[PDB]
Symmetry: C2
């Protein structure tokens, strides 16, 4: 499977930008663009040989970890650290079967009993997304926490907090140009901050937006989608136009009409 | 006032294309673009020195006539042929006052008792738009009919039929890329044909479309606009997106929101 590498050591908005750009390029085929927004491959018919891409993250402590992303949704399915492999609980049989093709050479393959959705992970971490700080520093630390879990070194709540960080800085940033933009700013000023309501609402709405756009009438939504501005105020979306510069990838919801 | 010249003598899709492109360039300031579609100047505040542009049409018989277009709507207000000037009946006082600045040097200025809208003109011509043929040949003839009206040579129904032709090949073609496209085809194959339902519906809907677009929610229309395909079948418009490559200019309906 394709591997993309990134290192938090001495990262810059440019090195981070190139990274997210490469991930997007690996996730999508260019075969499906809907209102200038690329759609991810459809799960039905997709061969396993083209089901995942790996992201090898390294940090300043010289520790490495490899995350596995499912190409049909940009979801982090599991990771490899040294000799072990951990996978979130598959939510179906095809998925439980697909992940058997990953990190086939690791000696210890483990499957968590919990899944990788935010609700579960915020529960296991004891903090909400609004409270977990994002930035290069938090990512640097997450690579170590994820790495040392494999050696008895990391606690369950820290494993969960670390995934929450990795998922927003990689998968969420790859899906939304808006969110990747928020990360680039944290990196530029070396800030470390929790995500505001705009980031969180977009994260929560990715699937609804992907459906609304794909089933819009010439780009017009049948019913508006309410989002939030950085200052917490509501803001309705009625057309795919305002989202073109905000959303980068869409999950496959339906075939395009003639 | 700016003058654009066109000659039907030996015209080609290219010479016709350059012409309509030049007219559009004179009509609009570039100061107002709404969803990638230029909006014509607003009548309120517009100085008379920037109220019109003249189109000097010449034909193979070496006859010339100069049409006057109102910049705020691309409407043909009148023409000059030799020593005389004819103006459709102004529908208000500012307009009756504005046209007093045109063809000030002609010796005989006449103002028709009828206006220049299609309904009136189809009545005076004794035929509907669907029945009057369009092409370079029909335009060539219209320049002569319009020219000889000034010398007792043309009959009222022929004057009206000739305006109907000039207006669709100049004003209507300048407003819609779609309609200019239909003319380019007539010219290329030297066809001469009456306009189909698609052309006519677009002509009829220019003002509604200009309002719907300008008052759309992020490009979404509050209520759909029904148009017709070349084969007479209805086709609903819900978003400004499908019109971007169809409509070239819009009449000013309202100020753009923040
Ligand atoms: N392990 C994971 N990988 C990617 N996205 C998610 C999510 C987010 O929650 C929802 C899903 O589409 C995505 O926006 N939860 N857990 C995730
Ligand atoms: N003399 C004229 N000039 C330009 N357009 C028109 C029309 C058309 O009818 C309506 C107006 O906006 C235009 O689409 N009628 N008479 C016209």
């Amino acid at each position: 499977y394709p591997i993309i590498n990134f290192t938090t050591a001495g990262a810059t908005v440019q090195s981070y930008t190139n990274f997210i750009r490469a991930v997007r390029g690996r996730l999508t085929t260019g075969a499906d663009v809907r209102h200038e927004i690329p759609v991810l491959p459809n799960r039905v018919g997709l061969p396993i040989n083209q089901r995942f891409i790996l992201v090898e993250l390294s940090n300043h402590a010289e520790l490495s970890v490899t995350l596995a992303l499912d190409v049909t949704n940009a979801y982090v399915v599991g990771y490899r650290a040294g000799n072990s492999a951990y996978f979130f609980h598959p939510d179906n049989q095809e998925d439980a079967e697909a992940i058997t093709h990953l990190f086939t050479d690791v000696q210890n393959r483990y499957t968590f009993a919990f899944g990788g959705n935010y609700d579960r992970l915020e529960q296991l971490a004891g903090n909400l997304r609004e409270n977990i700080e994002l930035g290069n520093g938090p990512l640097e630390e997450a690579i170590s926490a994820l790495y040392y879990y494999s050696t008895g070194g990391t606690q369950l709540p820290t494993l969960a907090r670390s995934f929450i960080i990795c998922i927003q800085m990689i998968s969420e940033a790859a899906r939304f140009q808006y969110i990747e933009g928020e990360m680039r700013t944290r990196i530029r000023y070396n800030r470390r901050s929790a995500p505001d309501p705009s980031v969180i609402t977009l994260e929560n709405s990715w699937g609804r937006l992907s459906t609304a756009i794909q089933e819009s009438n010439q780009g017009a939504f049948a019913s508006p989608i309410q989002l939030q501005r950085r200052n917490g105020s509501k803001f309705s979306v009625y057309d795919v136009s305002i989202l073109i510069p905000i959303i980068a990838l869409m999950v496959y919801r339906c075939a395009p009409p003639p």
